[PDB]
Amino acid sequence: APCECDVNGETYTVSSSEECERLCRKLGVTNCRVHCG
């Protein structure tokens, strides 16, 4: 399955862990987690 990114406590799906990181940077939130299933 694709990779999942948890920002602010909410869970989103991203193609890559770096995409997660970038997304969190775009939102401007430090609370950001990642795990790829």
- Tokens standing for 25? 């940077």
The experimental method behind these coordinates is NMR
**What distances in angstroms separate CA 10 from CA 1, 4, one per listed residue?**
18, 10
List CB contacts of 18: < 8 A, sequence separation 6 or more. Answer: none
Three-state secondary structure of the chain: CCEEEEECCEEEEECCHHHHHHHHHHHCCCCEEEEEC
